[PDB]
Structure formats: structure tokens, C-alpha cells
Amino acid sequence: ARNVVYPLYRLGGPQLRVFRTNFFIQLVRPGVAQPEDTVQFRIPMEMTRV
Amino acid sequence: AYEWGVRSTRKSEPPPLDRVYEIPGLEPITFAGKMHFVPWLARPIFPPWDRGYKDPRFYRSPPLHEHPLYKDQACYI
Amino acid sequence: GADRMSKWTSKRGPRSFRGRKGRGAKGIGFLTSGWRFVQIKEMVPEFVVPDLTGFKLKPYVSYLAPESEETPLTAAQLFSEAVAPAIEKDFKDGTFDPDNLEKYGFEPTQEGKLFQLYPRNFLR
Amino acid sequence: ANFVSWKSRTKYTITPVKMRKSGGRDHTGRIRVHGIGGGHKQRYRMIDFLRFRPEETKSGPFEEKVIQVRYDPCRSADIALVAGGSRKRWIIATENMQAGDTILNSNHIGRMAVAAREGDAHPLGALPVGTLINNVESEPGRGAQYIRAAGTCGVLLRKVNGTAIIQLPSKRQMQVLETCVATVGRVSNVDHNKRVIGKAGRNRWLGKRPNSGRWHRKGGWAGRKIRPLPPMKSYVKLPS
Amino acid sequence: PLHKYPVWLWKRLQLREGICSRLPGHYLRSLEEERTPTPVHYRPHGAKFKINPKNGQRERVEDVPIPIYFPPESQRGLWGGEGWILGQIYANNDKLSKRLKKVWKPQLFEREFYSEILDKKFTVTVTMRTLDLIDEAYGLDFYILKTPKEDLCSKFGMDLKRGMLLRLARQDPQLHPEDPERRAAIYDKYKEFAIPEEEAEWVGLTLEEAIEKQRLLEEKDPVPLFKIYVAELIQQLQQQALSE
Amino acid sequence: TVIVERWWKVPLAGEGRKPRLHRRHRVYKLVEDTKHRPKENLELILTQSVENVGVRGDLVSVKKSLGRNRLLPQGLAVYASPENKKLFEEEKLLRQE
RNA sequence: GCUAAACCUAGCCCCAAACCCACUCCACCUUACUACCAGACAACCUUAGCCAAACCAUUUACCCAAAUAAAGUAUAGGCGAUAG
RNA sequence: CUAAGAACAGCUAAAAGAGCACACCCGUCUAUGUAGCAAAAUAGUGGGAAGAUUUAUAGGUAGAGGCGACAAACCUACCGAGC
RNA sequence: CUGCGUCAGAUUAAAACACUGAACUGACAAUUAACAGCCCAAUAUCUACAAUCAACCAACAAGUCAUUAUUACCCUCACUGUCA
RNA sequence: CAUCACCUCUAGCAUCACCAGUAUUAGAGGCACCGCCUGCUGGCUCCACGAGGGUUCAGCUGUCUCUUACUUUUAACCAGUG
Ligand SMILES: [K+]
Ligand SMILES: [K+]
Ligand SMILES: [Mg+2]
Ligand SMILES: [Mg+2]
Ligand SMILES: [Mg+2]
Ligand SMILES: [Mg+2]
Ligand SMILES: [Mg+2]
Ligand SMILES: [Mg+2]
Ligand SMILES: [Mg+2]
Ligand SMILES: [Mg+2]
Ligand SMILES: [Mg+2]
Ligand SMILES: [Mg+2]
Ligand SMILES: [Mg+2]
Ligand SMILES: [Mg+2]
Ligand SMILES: [Mg+2]
Ligand SMILES: [Mg+2]
Ligand SMILES: [Mg+2]
Ligand SMILES: [Mg+2]
Ligand SMILES: [Mg+2]
Ligand SMILES: [Mg+2]
């Protein structure tokens, strides 16, 4: 999630879980030729590939 | 003899304690409750702190004499 | 000749400046010796997605619905709906004491809880 | 200025320590000594000027064997690497010192004088009168500070009541206790003052910058003006 | 435009609201008072009227104090109200000669004193004036207790007063625990300076220190509404049973 | 103590009002430095025998460089407070009786 | 007849009155607007000068808490300029 | 000035603040230009080009001063005292 | 810091031109990490012998590169730069 | 101007410059190598070197006697901008 404070993690701590996410992605058509399996999204800056 | 390490490069002496601590039966008023430094309040004396859990990235070894494999006789390696 | 009224981002500056500045994404690990990054599984936020099979509710609401007035939830309202019914039953029975408030649902301290209320240690 | 002295090492070692030049600048960043700047990079080799420093597990007189006499950039004189027991340290080499020689370091003061050998360290109370000495100390445990430069040598003029008169290379007498440890003989690089720089470029190799081009009419006598007394003020200058 | 209040009144206006208004009443009196300190670096006239020699008339005279600069190091000792005098002088004491900046500094000594109430010795920096004042007060403890705040001119001097007053108020047995008779004797000598513990705990504190002290007394975790509502619910239920 | 005086007269302010100081009112002239005045003798009541006087309760006067340094820190003497005199007066009275 | 020319509001000024503002989430003293590791660094100190004195060198007005009046008086001052 | 880096063909020579001569640095003479391409440039001709060299990066010294192989030079295109 | 990619434009001055006119306006599109940057548990303890093909030889201006002992530790490829 | 070389002056010592140094050193200066001569500091000679300032042999050439021809830019005219 974005614009929220992530709880700090230390060794042996609980798993970080998010139940409601505010990340909204949008599928877009690539402007250039792409491989068949490749899919292009627009994601918020705070979002990682993981 | 000539000591190695000029006093400027060594850690400076901590500032002298405020005179409020020298008066018995007197509780100093410090900035420990404000959680930040201010010049017009006494400097609190913080007790030593322990992390409370084992962290490999921030581990500090015990003193050398406290190591289990410590012998008075030296071994040349 | 530099633009001082534009947003300072990771795309500006030399190589050391560009790699040190980010975009706001939270860190999910740390760097070890040899510039090797170690990703911590517990630092990666895991999505708790429920099963939506056989779910009645839908994104929109039909217009053929009454215009109910809005009643914001308050602490006093929640206490009466949840805790008050239990206390009344115990009050009539005659077994009531402040020592047993933990049994009614009261939490004297937030330590030792997976989801602490203040300060909260969970995401939205 | 954010000036931190490189002299931060606290443990002695024979490893050459990298040092940063000052350029005549103090901690503030302004020039305090002129004509200093640039030159070839140098690594400082720590010198133990306290010749009598017995080991932690040892005491009393001990002996050291010279390993190598080499060139030191920091000082005019050469230095020698010696090994005594299980340690090695740098000392100031004498004029006649080679690899393999054995030097003696003692704090013993006998009833009579002893045969003084060049490079050995004995107290001033056990050295014959007139013997050339170098690397003297003001008081015991102070360390050698005087007669360090290449070829310099002092003179043991006299010894009376536990004190000795040392003739410094500047022909000045100095009185110190007879228990001060000194090194017998002259210092290495006797012909150091006989060198020729050859060109202005070699002075820039030693970290010395050219002098200011201003014509200073001021000097020891020219700049300082004796104030004429009112009676003598009339005779200061006479037209001719 | 104009301000509602003069600018010089804003300092006393901030004491009307906020945590300052919640400070004890006796403490607020000690700050708003402007008692004139005892003259040190100038000779007072001694009378309200004098006869001007030139015209032989009875003219009014006033004592105008000379500003005194107290260095920060003066707050860790007992200078007796002395301090650096930042002023000008005329060369050769001639008005027609040029004017030069002159600073007069007191002579400081690191003398040691012993306090009977605190049973502890201090190595403080004092002037020759402070030594004379302790001699005229017949002991360090009397000097600290008699000398007012504007005359001590030292934060350490006011801290000693607060410490001494608390021992005279709390009747703390920490003073000579092995000699109860001696402890009573010391408290019976300074009995003229008895101050209640409530008022003796704010003596010498500055405005910033008092604000911090008051905030600590007001610092508390908010009461959960569960306890509040349960108290309301039980009280309501008890009243309900009465009607039945 | 440096005691100084203003070269220039300060005009009267009145009752309840602060005087108006000018740039010229910062010019001072030294009147007297109390460090150069003749010394005085501190009056003390001795508790133990000393070389000057060996009688307890006998009022003595010595230089301030002696009472402050030796007599008072060592407990040899006490300040000549009026209350102390009354207490020692009773002690002397018991000796006579 | 082109370029142009005309317009009346926006708002502002001076008073009176009354003592003003700053937590929606997130980020912000490190290279501010940068989630996340042993610090110990800490504040306070006369204003000067231009200018006037036909130079300049002592000196030269600067709200200090009630409008008026006492009064530009007593005083101060290279007993000058001026200050009060 | 400090820190830690980089650059210098070929040839004659020799372990050279050597010679010739590119890159590079500098700017001797002449001409063009003079609101110009340019608030100092252009073309040709020149001095140096393994060294007291040239140069990129970061840091330091600030105006009652700094710095200066003294030209009263320079300190952000008016420095006998910056803005 | 999007600054001759695409499309459209009552378009229309880049020191001339311009319909496709285009180094103008609007919209849309884009530069994908392996390269580079962002590194490291503690406490002690170690590190005399240049470089120059480093072997000759010859130097001074004396130099640009090293650990071990014990304790702790076995989770894994994120982030940012990428156009003209 | 600086410059090796020479000379004068100052300083007997350490924990931020000098310096992690110690009178064969450091600083403040003069002069400008060397060689010869001199006093008890002064004057000549000389190797190379110089975008320094003069002079000169020979050659060279439109520098000139005495200018001329051609090419390019400019130029003038046409169009655009201005
Ligand atoms: K004038
Ligand atoms: K030349
Ligand atoms: Mg700008
Ligand atoms: Mg010189
Ligand atoms: Mg000169
Ligand atoms: Mg009045
Ligand atoms: Mg004038
Ligand atoms: Mg004039
Ligand atoms: Mg050459
Ligand atoms: Mg050449
Ligand atoms: Mg230069
Ligand atoms: Mg000149
Ligand atoms: Mg001139
Ligand atoms: Mg400028
Ligand atoms: Mg990589
Ligand atoms: Mg010259
Ligand atoms: Mg001629
Ligand atoms: Mg000819
Ligand atoms: Mg022809
Ligand atoms: Mg035309």
C-alpha cells in the first residue's frame, strides 16, 4: 500500500500482511512491437515488481 | 615517552554534568521527557541500553577474556 | 542556470546521486558485503485476498433503494451495541467486578497482540 | 574548516602510514606557514625515539640486531629497522650502521665508565666525557628530541652531581640529568648538507614552494627603525 | 494597522494562556516581580534630594543602575551579583580625548565551601564580594537563603536554595542518618526559612524549567472510554434498580 | 569590585518610569576598585586552642586569609553571630558556676 | 482608414475595532520534502557609521509605556553645533 | 592548497626542469573583426609539449579578509579593496 | 530534462522558405539490467622490501593496491540511472 | 618576478600549522648559478639559453622603382527576412 506507514520489521518478527491495498494498475497497449507473452501495465511509483 | 594519537583526533571529553545533580535530595529537570535536545534544560543521564534480541547485522562480541577458548598461555600461530 | 523550482528526483545528479535517491517504494531487504542484496520474505507485504466465489455484493447498487440517513459510528454507540448487552446480563445475575473487565473484552495493554491499536503495527 | 589531523593512529607499527599534506594550512584552513605545498607523496614511518623501551614480558638491558638501514622521506637522516626479541621498530640510524650489526640498550649506570660503541643506548651517567652523542632527552622517560638531524652530534662536556652538560650542535650548553638515555656517535647522512639541489624543480619535489616575489625592504635591521632621541634627532641626516 | 496590545506586553500575555496559566500562583508572582538588585558596581546617593552646588537648590536625585553582563560561566558559581561591565572610557580621563571601549572583569577564585544542610562540599568559582557576603551572613547556608533571586544572579545559587529549602521542609532524615540529634540541631537553626514543600519545589526554576515541570505533572495516558462508559453504565444500571 | 560612575548626567525619569539611557551614557569612569582597599579583620569565636589564642569561646580577630582558609574549614572557629555569642555566653556562665 | 484611441472594476491606502494563524492521509535538518541502527556539536557578549558642527578629532535628537501643562524651563555641551 | 585519479604519438638521443615534432597548454607577430561568430574571437605565423607540465572530480582559505614565482595580479565578464 | 518519434492543428516566423507545413501548439507514445549506482557483524591483532614488460642494470623525488584469532551468521537478486 | 648557488636574521622545542619535525633542522629575508677577484662586503669573465632590444653578410622576394592580371569573399541588381 501507498501513503501508509509500514510497520518496522526485526529478526523473528511476524509476516507483513496487507488486507486492503490502494494500488490500482491499468493495462495499456504498448506503443512498440512486443513479444506475445509480454504484458504492459502502468503502476504507481510506490509499487515494486515483487 | 611520546604518545601516539593527537588529542584532537581522540574522542572529546563529555561536557561536565550540570550542577543540579550535585545537590542531594534534588530532582533535576531534563529534556528526557521532551525526547529531544534543548539548551535551557539539564542533560539527562541515560542508563545503558540493550537491544533485547540477537541481530546478526548489529552483533557485538563479548570481551576477549569472556571468550570460552581463552587461555593465559599464548599460542603462536 | 539550474532549475531550483522543479522537483528533485533520482533522474538528476551524478551516478552516486541517482542510485541513492528512490521513488517512494518501501525497502524489502538490506545490502550485504559484495553489494549483494538479501531480500527478506517477511518484509514483503503479503496480500490477503479472500475467495469471491458466490459473493452477493456487487460494485454498484441498484437505484431502487431507500434513502437511509447517514449515522456515523461513535465509541459510545459501539459500546452500547457490543459490550453493554453482556454487562446487563451479568449485572442482573449479580456477578460483576472490575477485575473481570478483561473477560468482557477490554484489553488493559496492547503488548503481546498481533494487531496493536496504538501505535498500530499493521497496514491498511 | 573540516580539518582532521592524519596523526590519529594510536598503536605503534613499522608499517608505513599514509599521511596527508597540509600546504602550510592550520586547522582553520588559512595559511600559517608559507612556502609549503605539493611535492612527491610520502608515507610516514613511525620512529621510536625512546631507545630503552624493554618489552612487556622483559626488563633491564636488552639487545637489538639491525635488519636494514633505509631512506626516510620525512627526516633528513636515515632510519634503521631493528629487531629485539619478538618485536621490530624503527630507530634513527647512526653514521656507521649496517645490516647485521648488534646494538645494546641499557639503563644501567656502573661505578666506572664503559666502552661506548656507536649506535648503543646508555645513560648519560655511564658515558665517558667528550664522546659524541645524539638523540638526547631532557628527562628520563621523555624521549629523544634534540640532535636528531643528519650528521648532528652533541658533546658530553662534563658530569657533576648526577647532571651532565650537553653541547648542542648550535654550540649551546644544556644541563640534563645523568639518567637520560643517549645514543653514542653521530647520526647517519653526514654528507647530507653537501647535496646540490641542481634545479628549481627539485625544490618543488621536496614540497617547498617559491618565495614571494615582493621586494621586502623590511629585515632584521632595515625594517626595524631605531627611534632617534630628540637631542640626536637633529644629527640624523645632513645635506651634502 | 496597530496591535491590540503593546509589544512589550506580549511576554506577560503568554502567561495568561497555555501551560503557563496552569502554573502555581506563587510561582507566577516570583517572575512578574521586578525587585531592584542591590547596588554593586556603583555608589548609591543615599538620599532623595541634594543641593546642587552651582545654584544652591534642592534638586531630586535618582539612582540609575549600570547594566551588568553576566557570562554563561557565571551561572555555575557565586559571583555575588558581580559581572562584566561593558562600557566606554575617555583616554587619560579627558572628555576632549577619544573614546575607547573598556571591559572590567571581576577577580574569580575557586574556593571551597561546606553546607550544613546538604552535608556536601562544593568547589565553586566566587569573587571577593561573595566571600564577604558569606562572612556577613555567618555561613553559606544563610547567604543562600537570605539573598534574593535578583541578588544571587546565578542559576546554581538558586538551585542550592531549592535544595536547601526542600530539606528544611520535608524534614528529610537523609541529613546525618546516624546522628538524629545533630540532624535536629541543624534544622532548628534555619527554622526562620521554613517554606511549604508545595512552594519550595518551584524556587529558582526558570520559565522554561517550570513549563517542563508542569507538563510532566500533566503527562498521563488518556483514560480508555471502556472504563468511562462502564462506570456510566453501572451507575445508570444501579439507578435503574432503584426505580424497580 | 570595580565601582564606576557615568561621565554624563542621566536625566530624571520620574516616579514609576525607567530612565532613558543614551549612547553617551555608556561612558563610565572608574571611581574605586575595592580590591585595593585596606584589609579588614574577621571576628570569630574559637572552638579549639590555637597559637594566637588557646581559649575556647574567646572572640578573636585575624586576617580574612586565615579564618576563611584555616579556622573555618577545619572547625577551629565559628562565625561571631549574635546567636553564637549568646550560646557561648551561657557556656562561659556554667564554667564560672 | 490603418495603427490605434476610449471604459470600471479588480483590488488597494489610512483609521476604528478586536490580541492572530498553523494535526486529512504520506514525506520533510542526509543531497529538505529521502519508511527502517551507538550519538554525545550546542544558544546568550556595548552596535557602528553616514550625517550636523559649513573640516574634523569631544559631541550630534531616535516611542519605552497618561494626552495636556510645567517647558524648550532647570540642567548638559570643542559651555560650539546642539542635547534636555 | 588538500584528497584520490588521468594524459603526453613518432624521431634523435640519453637514465636530461634535453632537441625536433602531434594531441594538448599557452598567446609572439601580422591581418581580419570593432553592436563582431565572439562584453577578447578568427586565419596564418609562433613558445612549451616527461615536466616548476597539462587536466577531470570533491574539499579548504571570504572582504578590517583571502590568495599571490609582487602584475597593486586574482577573489563569478567595472577589485587601489567583491557583491 | 523530453528539447526534428507518431498524429492532428483556426496552425503558421525558426533571424530565407515551407503544402507533407515544422527545431510551433495540443494529444499520444517511450528509455525494460546482465552495465552503472546503492555495499560490509563485533573486538582485538597484523601490513620493513615501489613502479617502470620487472628480468637485467640504474636510481630518488622513496612511492598507486596484503591479514589473522575468536565470537556472530547459511535469509536471497529489491531499489534507482537508461530518450534526443 | 621566480630559480639552483651564495648570504643575512630568528629559534634549544612536541600531541591540530611549523611537525607527528629538532640547528646538516625550521622560519623570515637579500641576491641570482658556477669560476675569478675583494672586504674582514664589492668588481669582472664566461657555457649554453631568449617569440628580449639593436646591428650585419648572403640569399630571398610586388616591400619598393611601378604597379598589373586572375580567382574567391564582399560588392551591385532580383526575391525573402530585417
Ligand atoms: K566633509
Ligand atoms: K625572451
Ligand atoms: Mg536560476
Ligand atoms: Mg629564498
Ligand atoms: Mg626577491
Ligand atoms: Mg512628570
Ligand atoms: Mg561635517
Ligand atoms: Mg574634506
Ligand atoms: Mg624538453
Ligand atoms: Mg621543444
Ligand atoms: Mg602562479
Ligand atoms: Mg613592482
Ligand atoms: Mg605600480
Ligand atoms: Mg567581479
Ligand atoms: Mg550490476
Ligand atoms: Mg631578478
Ligand atoms: Mg640601418
Ligand atoms: Mg642584404
Ligand atoms: Mg599583368
Ligand atoms: Mg533586398
From Swiss-Prot, chain C:
Q: Name one GO biological process term.
A: mitochondrial translation
Q: Which residues form a coiled coil?
A: none
> What is a GO molecular function of this protein?
structural constituent of ribosome
UniProt cross-references to Pfam families, sorted A to Z:
MRP-L27 (PF09809)
Recorded hits in InterPro entries, A to Z, give:
Ribosomal_mL41
Q: Which domain of life is it from?
A: Eukaryota
Distribution of this protein across tissues and organs: Present in kidney, liver, thymus and testis, and at lower level in brain and spleen (at protein level).
Localization recorded for this chain is:
Mitochondrion
Alphabetical GO CC annotations of the entry are: mitochondrial inner membrane; mitochondrial large ribosomal subunit; mitochondrion; ribonucleoprotein complex
Alphabetical keyword list: Apoptosis, Cell cycle, Mitochondrion, Ribonucleoprotein, Ribosomal protein, Transit peptide
Q: What exactly does this protein do?
A: Component of the mitochondrial ribosome large subunit. Also involved in apoptosis and cell cycle. Enhances p53/TP53 stability, thereby contributing to p53/TP53-induced apoptosis in response to growth-inhibitory condition. Enhances p53/TP53 translocation to the mitochondria. Has the ability to arrest the cell cycle at the G1 phase, possibly by stabilizing the CDKN1A and CDKN1B (p27Kip1) proteins.
Q: What PANTHER family does UniProt report for this protein, alphabetically?
A: LARGE RIBOSOMAL SUBUNIT PROTEIN ML41, MITOCHONDRIAL RIBOSOMAL PROTEIN L41
Protein family per UniProt: Belongs to the mitochondrion-specific ribosomal protein mL41 family.
Q: Report the protein name in the record.
A: Large ribosomal subunit protein mL41
Swiss-Prot record, chain D:
Q: Which GO terms describe its cellular component?
A: mitochondrial inner membrane; mitochondrial large ribosomal subunit; mitochondrion; nucleoplasm
Q: Name one GO molecular function term.
A: structural constituent of ribosome
The highest taxon in the source lineage is Eukaryota
Q: Where is the composition biased (Basic residues)?
A: 214-223
Record keywords, A-Z = Mitochondrion, Ribonucleoprotein, Ribosomal protein, Transit peptide
Q: What is its main location?
A: mitochondrion
Q: Which GO terms describe its biological process?
A: mitochondrial translation
- Could you tell me which residues belong to the region Disordered? 204-223
Q: Which protein family is named in the record?
A: Belongs to the universal ribosomal protein uL2 family.
Binding partners and assembly: Component of the mitochondrial large ribosomal subunit (mt-LSU). Mature mammalian 55S mitochondrial ribosomes consist of a small (28S) and a large (39S) subunit. The 28S small subunit contains a 12S ribosomal RNA (12S mt-rRNA) and 30 different proteins. The 39S large subunit contains a 16S rRNA (16S mt-rRNA), a copy of mitochondrial valine transfer RNA (mt-tRNA(Val)), which plays an integral structural role, and 52 different proteins.
Q: What is the protein name given in its UniProt record?
A: Large ribosomal subunit protein uL2m
- State the species of origin: Homo sapiens (Human)
- What range of the parent protein does this fragment cover? 61 to 300 of 305
Curated annotation (Swiss-Prot), chain E:
Q: Which GO terms describe its molecular function?
A: RNA binding; structural constituent of ribosome
What keywords tag this UniProt record? Mitochondrion, Ribonucleoprotein, Ribosomal protein, Transit peptide
Residue range covered by the transit peptide: 1-54
Offer one example of a GO biological process linked to this entry. Answer: translation
Can you name a GO cellular component term? cytosol
Chief location: mitochondrion
Keyword Mitochondrion listed? The answer is yes
Q: Give expression by tissue.
A: Found in a variety of normal tissues including spleen, testes, thymus, liver, kidney, brain, adrenal, lung and retinal tissue.
Quote the SUPFAM superfamilies the UniProt record gives.
L28p-like
Q: Which InterPro entries match?
A: Ribosomal_bL28, Ribosomal_bL28/bL31-like_sf, Ribosomal_bL28_sf
Q: Where in the cell is it found?
A: Mitochondrion
Record's family? Answer: Belongs to the bacterial ribosomal protein bL28 family.
Q: How does it assemble?
A: Component of the mitochondrial large ribosomal subunit (mt-LSU). Mature mammalian 55S mitochondrial ribosomes consist of a small (28S) and a large (39S) subunit. The 28S small subunit contains a 12S ribosomal RNA (12S mt-rRNA) and 30 different proteins. The 39S large subunit contains a 16S rRNA (16S mt-rRNA), a copy of mitochondrial valine transfer RNA (mt-tRNA(Val)), which plays an integral structural role, and 52 different proteins. Interacts with OXA1L.
Query: Any other noteworthy remark?
Result: Potentially represents an important therapeutic reagent for HLA-A24 patients. This antigen is recognized by tumor-infiltrating lymphocyte (TIL) 1290 in the context of HLA-A24.
Q: What's the protein name?
A: Large ribosomal subunit protein bL28m
| Species assigned in the record | Homo sapiens (Human)
Gene from which this protein is expressed: MRPL28
Curated annotation (Swiss-Prot), chain F:
- The protein's assembly and partners: Component of the mitochondrial large ribosomal subunit (mt-LSU). Mature mammalian 55S mitochondrial ribosomes consist of a small (28S) and a large (39S) subunit. The 28S small subunit contains a 12S ribosomal RNA (12S mt-rRNA) and 30 different proteins. The 39S large subunit contains a 16S rRNA (16S mt-rRNA), a copy of mitochondrial valine transfer RNA (mt-tRNA(Val)), which plays an integral structural role, and 52 different proteins.
Q: Which family does it belong to?
A: Belongs to the bacterial ribosomal protein bL9 family.
Record-given protein name: Large ribosomal subunit protein bL9m
Q: Where in the cell is it found?
A: Mitochondrion
Record-annotated membrane-spanning stretches: none
Question: What is the gene name?
Answer: MRPL9
Which domain of life does the protein's organism represent? Eukaryota
